[PDB]
Design a protein around this ligand. Structure first.
Ligand SMILES: *[C@@H]1O[C@H](CO)[C@@H](O[C@@H]2O[C@H](CO)[C@@H](O)[C@H](O)[C@H]2NC(C)=O)[C@H](O)[C@H]1NC(C)=O
Ligand SMILES: *[C@@H]1O[C@H](CO)[C@@H](O)[C@H](O)[C@H]1NC(C)=O
Ligand SMILES: *[C@@H]1O[C@H](CO)[C@@H](O)[C@H](O)[C@H]1NC(C)=O
Ligand SMILES: *[C@@H]1O[C@H](CO)[C@@H](O)[C@H](O)[C@H]1NC(C)=O
Ligand SMILES: *[C@@H]1O[C@H](CO)[C@@H](O)[C@H](O)[C@H]1NC(C)=O
Ligand code: MET
Length: 605
């Protein structure tokens, strides 16, 4: 165990903390019910990262190789680190920065890396909400806007790119975003998304005006709504035409795929983002309730209420992906049948889906010169499932075309998008708490000002920085920041704290501490998973990320309607300067830990 001098006289004495609890009646807020606490920590570690990043990170890796590693890494790392951070948040009685500043005070960097990364994530995790509510505004009309192609100035046919692609892709790629051909090409500001950005950053600031005592009621409402609308959509999904053909595709593991470092790294970077570990949000939430609270129970139940709603959203999403795939397959087959009969004049009900191959052999032996002119298609299932589906285009290109092929669609669409909105709002509640708490714990604003002014300043600042995603070339910036800021700094912060708690604070002190708090030493499981397995797994994930960054080309997809075979996605490389951004997003917020450590150890000569 590292020396760590002066650990006492900086933290409460373990024998007088229940006396300190009385001073917490006025200087700190407190939860009204236990239910509010469990719901807020349940509404913070769920949503938009189980529907918008999970199925993409599943499909890219086939679809079956991202469910075994995810669950192993869950049961091995998501639970123990979460229990650890709950227990600290309750013992040390301070926010997300005052804790890591009491353990070996040269470790205040974590209080800054966590703040910076919870800011960088919230920078775009709000413009996603902006797009969602822009879609929600376009409902409330009986013919859905994305159900037809608009005609040109010369009313004879559809516009070009609406004809060569789906009618729903000419609502996301040309009417909503108006995407330009390349990231180096950026144009106007696109007011009609400034409106939605302002509305999103206003709803958020209208809900979290005072930290707690104002997220309470919004947690009562917007953390139970998704758990009934999700079931309503599951019941409708499993009775579709193409169900049981997608959810069976989800669970067939391509065994030679989970033997690649890429899938392991993706599961590792996703199990920390499905929760909110290393964000600095759960420390502060678990720093309010009373002392003699059974910190274990809550931890375990939350760990098993989220990891369950992670395969309960994968089922509902793949139950729609399979439906869309089998629909396109039947359409291709009907088109082939039609191209055959229009060419040979056969009756209507003699070429059906089972005697097709024999009937096609039965014509080529009768008109060999008339047959070898028809351009047949090719279409087989298990090739329409693994298609070009990416984030920002999984919950807006799939669910919005399968929502218009059901009766009374102007209701299902509104229900689905209110589900997504009230599923993504909670997360931002927690994140804004995790960015506001360490700021006023830094004495950055004179303490005589109210809390509303600081929340308003943060909201205005992040809104004004959020003009970068509303340009034409806007979806590319978002894809880039999403990838890198969700991948790299999270796991390094998590490892650094998981090491600092068990090897700088002592594990035995923490042990008898939790013993006095709840009333029993933790089982052997927690001991073994805290002392050896958790840091060892982390190192592996780290090296895998470092071996999955070199030797893998850095490419992004463009739209470019002028390029031939246009329905397919064209893939190019970023310009050279982009690495600069890749630093300022994956650097400073994950390098201020050793930087501050060196600054503090070289201040003391
Ligand atoms: C199952 O995963 C393997 C990887 O282990 C896939 O094999 C790759 O397939 C792509 C096809 O685009 C090739 O470019 C790679 O060279 C293959 N790699 C290896 C190591 O064989 C395989 O395609 C996957 N299964 C299916 C049905 O696609
Ligand atoms: C439609 O008609 C107008 C006038 O007849 C013509 O100028 C225009 O070019 C036509 N549209 C196209 C796409 O050619
Ligand atoms: C979409 O962007 C193009 C730039 O390529 C611009 O000319 C056009 O005006 C934009 N759409 C609308 C409706 O303004
Ligand atoms: C379709 O027509 C062919 C020729 O008229 C006939 O042999 C075949 O039996 C018909 N289909 C069925 C299902 O009877
Ligand atoms: C059609 O029959 C000819 C033999 O007359 C053969 O050479 C050709 O490959 C056949 N085409 C198909 C599609 O079977
Ligand atoms: C500011 S956290 C962003 C979303 C949330 N943490 C989640 O994992 O769903």
């Amino acid at each position: 165990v590292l020396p760590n001098p002066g650990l006492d006289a900086r933290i409460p004495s373990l024998a007088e903390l229940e006396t300190i609890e009385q001073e917490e009646a006025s200087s700190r807020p407190k939860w009204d019910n236990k239910a509010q606490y469990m719901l807020t920590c349940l509404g913070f570690c769920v949503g938009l990262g189980n529907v918008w990043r999970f199925p993409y990170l599943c499909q890219s890796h086939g679809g079956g190789a991202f469910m075994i590693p995810f669950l192993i890494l869950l049961v091995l790392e998501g639970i123990p680190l979460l229990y650890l951070e709950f227990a600290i948040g309750q013992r040390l009685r301070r926010g997300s920065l005052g804790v890591w500043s009491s353990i070996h005070p040269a470790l205040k960097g974590l209080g800054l890396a966590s703040m910076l990364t919870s800011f960088m994530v919230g920078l775009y995790y709000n413009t996603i909400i902006s797009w969602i509510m822009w879609y929600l505004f376009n409902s409330f009309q009986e013919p859905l806007p994305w159900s037809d192609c608009p005609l040109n100035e010369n009313q004879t046919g559809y516009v070009d790119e609406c004809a060569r692609s789906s009618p729903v892709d000419y609502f996301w790629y040309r009417e909503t975003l108006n995407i330009s051909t390349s990231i180096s090409d950026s144009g106007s500001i696109q007011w009609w998304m400034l409106l939605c950005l302002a509305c999103a950053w206003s709803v958020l600031y209208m809900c979290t005006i005072r930290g707690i005592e104002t997220t309470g009621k919004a947690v009562y409402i917007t953390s139970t709504l998704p758990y009934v609308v999700l079931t309503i959509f599951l019941i409708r999904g499993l009775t579709l035409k193409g169900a049981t053909n997608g959810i069976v595709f989800l669970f067939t593991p391509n065994v030679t795929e989970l033997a690649q470092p890429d899938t392991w790294l993706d599961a590792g970077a996703q199990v920390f983002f499905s929760f909110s570990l290393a964000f600095g949000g759960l420390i502060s939430f678990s720093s309010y309730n009373s002392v003699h609270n059974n910190c274990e129970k809550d931890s375990v139940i939350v760990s098993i209420i989220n990891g369950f709603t992670s395969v309960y959203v994968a089922i509902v999403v793949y139950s729609v992906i399979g439906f869309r795939a089998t629909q396109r397959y039947d359409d291709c087959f009907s088109t082939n049948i039609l191209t055959l009969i229009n060419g040979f004049d056969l009756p209507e009900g003699n070429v059906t889906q089972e005697n097709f191959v024999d009937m096609q052999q039965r014509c080529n032996a009768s008109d060999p010169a008339a047959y070898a002119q028809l351009v047949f298609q090719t279409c087989d299932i298990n090739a329409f499932l693994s298609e070009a589906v990416e984030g920002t285009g999984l919950a807006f290109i799939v669910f919005t075309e399968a929502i218009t092929k059901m009766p009374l669609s102007p209701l299902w669409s509104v229900l689905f998008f209110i589900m997504l909105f009230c599923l993504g709002l909670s997360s931002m509640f927690g994140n804004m708490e995790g960015v506001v708490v360490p700021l006023q714990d830094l004495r950055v604003i004179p303490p005589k000002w109210p809390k509303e002014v600081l929340t308003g300043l943060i909201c205005l600042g992040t809104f004004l920085i959020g003009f970068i995603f509303t340009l034409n070339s806007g979806q590319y910036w978002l894809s880039l920041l999403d990838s890198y800021a969700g991948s790299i700094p999270l796991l390094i912060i998590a490892f650094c704290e998981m090491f600092s708690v068990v090897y700088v604070y002592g594990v035995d002190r923490f042990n008898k501490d939790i013993e006095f708090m709840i009333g029993h030493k933790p089982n052997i499981f927690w001991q073994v998973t805290w002392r050896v397995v958790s840091p060892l797994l982390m190192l592996i994930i780290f090296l895998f990320f470092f071996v999955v960054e070199v030797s893998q080309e850095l490419t992004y997809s463009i739209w470019d309607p002028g390029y031939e075979e246009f329905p397919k996605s064209q893939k190019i490389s970023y310009p050279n300067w982009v690495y600069v951004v890749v630093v300022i997003v994956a650097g400073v917020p994950s390098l201020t830990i050793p930087g501050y450590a060196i600054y503090k150890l070289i201040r003391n000569h």
